[PDB]
């Protein structure tokens, strides 16, 4: 994993460059929006369990996936569903603080589309629950912070489809 700072040091290190004016622009962009990210990271951490309760109620709680024979039928199947939404919300907050989507490829999306196909989990329903969690969060934290969190929700959705 690398954040917005480590991402700029690593890209200049493989070229042998001192930090020029173009690397200093990317470093200034993160330092300016840095106060906005520590504010949303503390607002999502305190409403973590109730964000996913409201995001499931808007997408999957009132479909028929929980009907007998569905994926989310048993209690074990239902408890594992909401544990993933715990994963996606917690790893999209690591990505919004770092300012880099690098941690999602390393610790989330690695072999995940094959894991859902082996188990039978609907991929399009998970993307629909993530799109609801993206909308529930964008109203809690605001428009600027909510538009950054929605940048790393789309990254999990694109790497899952």
């Amino acid at each position: 994993m690398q954040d917005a700072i480590t991402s700029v040091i690593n890209a200049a290190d493989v070229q042998g460059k001192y930090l020029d004016a173009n690397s200093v622009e990317k470093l200034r962009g993160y330092f300016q929006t840095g106060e906005l990210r520590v504010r949303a990271a503390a607002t999502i951490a305190a409403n973590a369990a109730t964000i996913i309760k409201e995001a499931v109620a808007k997408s999957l709680l009132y479909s028929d996936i929980t009907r007998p024979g569905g994926n989310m039928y048993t209690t074990r199947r239902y408890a594992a569903c909401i544990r993933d939404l715990d994963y996606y919300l917690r790893y999209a907050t690591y990505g919004m603080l770092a300012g880099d989507p690098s941690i999602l490829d390393e610790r989330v999306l690695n072999g995940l589309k094959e894991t859902y196909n082996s188990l039978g989990v609907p991929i399009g329903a998970t993307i629909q629950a993530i799109q609801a969690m993206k909308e529930v969060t964008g109203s809690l934290v605001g428009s600027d912070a909510g538009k950054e969190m929605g940048l790393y929700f789309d990254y999990i959705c694109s790497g899952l489809s």
Partner: peptide
Amino acid sequence: SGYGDYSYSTDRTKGHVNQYYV
């Protein structure tokens, strides 16, 4: 495998196709 087990064949839910009028 176990007692409550998932299979594509015994899944009559509209969960793999998002027909949201059902």
